[PDB]
């Protein structure tokens, strides 16, 4: 059981695009005050992931990588593969 991976379910607020949340405070879920102590109307937002090779594929862990490019000007960083002419009508591909 790979319980190292964990997820959050009892979070009050939504997140903006590409917004990180790392706070692990006890989530106050309702009317009765908790004063920071889990109990009535209070849950822990963090939950460990039950992750074993014996599991359903939907329940099975998936490694997800998200890349957010910016196809705009300014120097890039990635561009697979020249010589500049200087007076003739020639197609140019200067950094993008």
């Amino acid at each position, epitope marked *: *059981g790979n*319980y190292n991976y964990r997820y959050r379910l*009892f979070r009050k607020s939504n997140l903006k695009p590409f917004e990180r949340d790392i706070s692990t405070e006890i989530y106050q*879920a309702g009317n009765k005050p908790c004063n920071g102590v*889990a*109990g*009535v*109307n*209070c*849950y822990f937002p963090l*939950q*460990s992931y*039950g992750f*074993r090779p*014996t*599991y*359903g594929v939907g*329940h099975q862990p998936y490694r997800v990588v998200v890349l957010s490019f910016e196809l705009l000007h300014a120097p890039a960083t990635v561009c697979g593969p020249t010589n500049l002419v200087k007076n003739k009508c020639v197609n140019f591909n200067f950094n993008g």
Partner: nanobody, 124 residues
Framework: SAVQLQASGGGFVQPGGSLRLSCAAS????????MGWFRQAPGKEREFVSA????????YYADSVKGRFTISRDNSKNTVYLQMNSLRAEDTATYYC????????????????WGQGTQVTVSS
């Protein structure tokens, strides 16, 4: 499908004795599923303890608790009861009540719920 499983009780007891673990549901679940417990030793990862259904038909005990810890649900009180005996070292930890959701157990793998626990300490 969100339960605020309420837990209460605890105290300090002596080694080699016996006690009980508490786990009661005070919220709205997703179905009539299984109930159990999970424990975590200091400096060690969380460890599964025991598994039992809504009707105490199937009795899955851990080997560290077999013959000594006898889990059993209630005729009418709707509460499983892990009654201990001859306590060992591994059974003294911070316990969390487990809750699965299945009738025919193909595998004991899928978990569905969690709740608060009871502060049980076993020392002289």
């Amino acid at each position: 499908s969100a339960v605020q499983l309420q837990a209460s009780g605890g105290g300090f007891v002596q080694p080699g004795g016996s006690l009980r673990l508490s786990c009661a549901a005070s919220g709205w679940a997703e179905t009539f599923g299984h109930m159990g417990w999970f424990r975590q030793a200091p400096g060690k990862e969380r460890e599964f303890v025991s598994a039992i259904d809504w009707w105490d038909t199937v009795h899955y005990y851990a080997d560290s608790v077999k013959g000594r810890f006898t889990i059993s649900r209630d005729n009418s009180k709707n509460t499983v009861y892990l009654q201990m005996n001859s306590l060992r070292a591994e059974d003294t930890a911070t316990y969390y009540c487990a809750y699965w959701d299945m009738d025919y157990l193909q595998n004991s793998i899928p978990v569905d719920y969690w709740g608060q626990g009871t502060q049980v300490t076993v020392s002289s």
